[PDB]
Design a protein around this ligand. Structure first.
Ligand SMILES: CSC[C@H]1O[C@@H](n2cnc3c(N)ncnc32)[C@H](O)[C@@H]1O
Ligand SMILES: CCCCCCCC(=O)NC1=CC(=O)CCC1
Length: 184
């Protein structure tokens, strides 16, 4: 796949609709996070703002096959406000930490999506990423080789095993993702 990072403020209308539809299909239809909706397929919450950073992966036909959301911890974020109890410690508010959420890929698919997210966050000054991740996804991160470690004990939410996860943007993570080591 090919990755596209959107960090220019409010998403253009067509991208917002296309991403919203892809998210609806993954998080609502696939994972069943909400009941079926009516009208346009759209999945968005209070964390989708003009300042939100997005990563979209597109296949050979230019269709979305992956997504990711990046938020600075110095501003409101999901783990902080919604799932703070998943953390061993209090939720961080630092320029060096960004939250990765709504991460999905439609194996060697996850890698490019993660690389784009890390690269972007690093260029914005982040030294670590944090976020609630399915343990199955946590295992892929481990296999990919990034330096991921737990920020809390695992818990099964509505039948889905997840855990607050850290990803250190260090030499190991950068190398595993084929990114510029200088980003360290
Ligand atoms: C991220 S772990 C998956 C759980 O997070 C919930 N979730 C995702 N985003 C939000 C949100 N903005 N507010 C409340 N719950 C959320 C989903 O409905 C699912 O049950
Ligand atoms: C610091 C790690 C942050 C990663 C957060 C993962 C985000 C997320 O929404 N998880 C998902 C993983 C899947 O397996 C399918 C779609 C949902």
């Amino acid at each position: 796949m090919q990755t596209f990072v959107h960090e220019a403020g409010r998403l253009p209308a067509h991208i917002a609709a296309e991403l919203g539809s892809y998210r609806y299909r993954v998080f609502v239809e696939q994972l069943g996070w909400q009941l079926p909706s009516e009208d346009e397929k759209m999945e968005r919450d209070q964390y989708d703002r003009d300042d939100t950073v997005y990563v979209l992966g597109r296949d050979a036909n230019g269709e979305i096959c992956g997504c990711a959301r990046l938020l600075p911890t110095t501003r409101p974020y999901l783990l902080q406000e919604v799932f703070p109890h998943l953390l061993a410690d209090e939720a961080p508010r630092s320029a060096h930490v960004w939250e990765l959420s709504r991460f999905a890929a439609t194996a060697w698919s996850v890698r490019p999506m993660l690389a784009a997210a890390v690269e972007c966050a690093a260029r914005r000054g982040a030294r670590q990423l944090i976020g609630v991740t399915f343990c199955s996804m946590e295992r892929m991160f481990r296999r990919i080789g990034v330096h991921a470690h737990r920020a809390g004990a695992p818990v099964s939410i509505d039948g889905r095993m997840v855990v607050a996860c850290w990803i250190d943007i260090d030499a190991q993570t950068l190398a595993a993702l084929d990114l510029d080591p200088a980003l360290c």
